[PDB]
């Protein structure tokens, strides 16, 4: 590796005429790229109606009937059909634009439940009725606290006195004075700002409470074929909201950080276990405890959710590393 010597034998001014000879290497032929790639390119369909300024002769239209029909999910997606209220509002959404729905290479998923699916109900797997009462209490407390600390106190503190709070003058080194609301913001931009802020804050608080409470599972019932589990969770108005989940969607898996297993909620005997419906990337937080679950079907639900939590999550031992993966047999057939 004497680099100078390498240079002394690498770039010689004599071989200049042959030095920059870009040569297509005569390497081994690869049928995938040297045979299959050309012929497939050679079979490219052609059209005579390319856009004069923007089209291309090989830009052929793909038939929608030739697009891959949806078989990924056995449940409908009403977001494709939208909501009548939106129609009644004539709202312009990105999930209802027909051009956006006109996928060129694939066929869009069906917006209605698949005809194979039966909507009949079966038997309840788990139930927790007092959760509704607890959630209602929490939501009512949140609403009452927001109203009190935000409106009732501000209403009196701003419109029912002339002396400001001690927090108003602790930082200002100015002579004391009284405050009145009849000589402030003559061009009342503060009124619309306060109204908009209050409306948006109330909406955000409601939506956040609904999202927080919407992950837990309040009532569950596996279907007659146990394919579509009907579950009622907590609704935003404190009521119940019913949905369905496909059997293949739910699972229980080790966390992404294997060191966090000991700090998992399900590690406790009276904890919580999350079934993750992978189809909608949804979560159903069942109470990890024996009292709430139904004895008859639990094992099957346990057998239907425990698929990735295997020995591989811990690794392979010294005697097991020999069988880590499937052996690749190459060259024994030529």
């Amino acid at each position: 590796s004497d680099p100078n010597d390498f240079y002394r034998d690498a770039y010689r001014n004599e071989n200049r005429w042959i030095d920059q000879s870009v040569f297509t290497p005569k390497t081994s032929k690869m049928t995938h790229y040297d045979v299959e790639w050309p012929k497939e390119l050679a079979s490219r369909p052609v059209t005579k109606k390319f856009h004069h300024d923007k089209g291309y002769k090989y830009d052929v239209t793909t038939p929608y009937d030739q697009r891959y029909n949806y078989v990924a999910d056995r449940l409908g997606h009403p977001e494709i059909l939208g909501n009548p209220f939106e129609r009644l509002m004539r709202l312009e959404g990105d999930i209802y634009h027909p051009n956006y729905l006109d996928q060129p290479f694939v066929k869009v998923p069906n917006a209605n439940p698949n005809a194979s699916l039966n909507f009949e109900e079966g038997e309840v797997l788990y139930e927790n009725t007092r959760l509704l009462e607890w959630a209602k209490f929490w939501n009512y407390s949140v609403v009452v606290g927001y109203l009190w600390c935000a409106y009732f106190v501000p209403y009196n503190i701003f419109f029912k006195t002339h002396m400001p709070l001690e927090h108003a003058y602790d930082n200002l080194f100015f002579p004391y004075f009284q405050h009145t609301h009849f000589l402030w913001d003559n061009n009342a931009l503060h009124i619309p700002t306060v109204g908009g802020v209050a409306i948006y804050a109330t909406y955000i608080a409601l939506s956040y409470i609904n999202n927080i409470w919407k992950d837990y599972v309040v009532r569950a019932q596996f279907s007659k074929d146990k394919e579509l589990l009907f579950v009622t969770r907590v609704s935003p108005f404190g009521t119940t909201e019913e949905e369905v989940y496909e059997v293949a969607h739910l699972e229980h898996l080790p966390p992404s950080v294997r060191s966090g297993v000991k700090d998992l909620s399900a590690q406790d005997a009276d904890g919580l276990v999350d079934v993750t419906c992978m189809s909608s990337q949804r979560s159903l937080v069942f109470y990890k405890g024996d009292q709430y679950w139904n004895p008859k079907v639990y094992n099957d639900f346990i057998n239907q959710t425990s698929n990735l939590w295997t020995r591989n999550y811990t690794g392979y031992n010294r005697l097991e590393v020999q069988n880590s993966v499937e052996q690749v047999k190459i060259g024994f057939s030529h």
Partner: protein, 294 residues
């Protein structure tokens, strides 16, 4: 911090990731930083200054002559609109610049000018964890710092656009393609290993390691410690995840562990000789049948 391209990149992120993964010249020319470009030689008749353009008929270019040490510019800034097809000589400089029309392919011609483009920077790629370091002493010096780690186990493969759609809508096709790609990667790795072995046999080692005996002993000890720590961590993880890994005999193992620890932590103190701890003893008690083999 590195984006999951299989679910995110559609057109622009697709081009950027493809450039960062394959270094295709046009692709590189797609994302070359405007701050600086690789400096080439002066344009001669035999050695034209190769100015690349991604399949564009014309490109504006300025002529500065032969730059000197004293002055960064040699000649007056004369701008010309070089067109693809033939070399053009800036008259004031006599500078022969040749336009190159880059076409999206994998031909050896693309390999000819592979060294004419500076490699793309990976610092700005991916998501960032800090808006901007508001340090006036580091305003234009260091790139943004990140709090998360960047995985390096990724192996990227290009896909035909419509075919990619078929992967996005058909999970079974995605699984089959992933298995086939893993098999292909394994085959390629085995072939590379065989090639390296053959090259070593036909040529020999490049040399001996210029390392110290103390460092060599420390490295051997470090390897042994790494193996031991890996075994210990594996045992700890196996014990911790006992409930979820196995569910049928979990009740029996838990009951046996509780009974054994009851007569070990109550009514009797446990004098532990060696590195065996209470957690290790409980783990050994739980999967008692497991440790009986290996």
């Amino acid at each position: 911090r590195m984006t999951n391209t299989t679910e995110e990149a559609f057109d622009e992120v697709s081009h950027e990731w493809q450039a960062l993964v394959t270094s295709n010249p046009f692709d590189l020319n797609v994302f070359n930083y405007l701050e600086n470009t690789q400096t080439s030689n002066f344009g001669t008749v035999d050695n034209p200054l190769v100015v690349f353009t991604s399949e564009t008929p014309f490109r504006y270019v300025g002529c500065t002559g032969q730059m000197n040490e004293d002055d960064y510019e040699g000649h007056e800034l004369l701008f010309f609109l070089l067109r693809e097809g033939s070399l053009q000589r800036c008259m004031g400089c006599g500078q022969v610049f040749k336009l190159v029309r880059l076409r999206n392919e994998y031909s050896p011609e693309m390999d000819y000018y592979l060294s004419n483009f500076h490699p793309y920077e990976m610092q700005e790629m991916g998501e960032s964890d800090t808006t901007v370091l508001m340090s006036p002493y580091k305003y234009a010096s260091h790139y943004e710092y990140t709090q998360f780690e960047t995985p390096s186990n990724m192996v990227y493969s290009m896909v035909n656009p419509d075919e990619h759609d078929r992967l996005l809508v058909d999970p079974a096709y995605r699984m089959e393609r992933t298995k086939a790609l893993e098999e292909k990667y394994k085959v390629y790795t085995s072939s590379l290993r065989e090639v390296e072995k053959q090259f070593e046999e036909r040529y020999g080692r490049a040399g001996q390691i210029n390392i110290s005996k103390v460092t060599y002993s420390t490295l051997i000890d470090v390897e042994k410690a790494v193996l031991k720590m890996d075994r210990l961590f594996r045992k700890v993880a196996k014990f911790e995840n006992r409930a979820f890994i196995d569910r049928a005999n979990h009740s029996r193992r838990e009951k046996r562990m509780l009974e054994r620890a009851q007569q070990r932590w109550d009514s009797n103190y446990s004098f532990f000789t060696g590195s065996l701890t209470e957690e290790e003893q409980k783990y050994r008690d739980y999967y008692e049948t497991e440790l009986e083999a290996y």
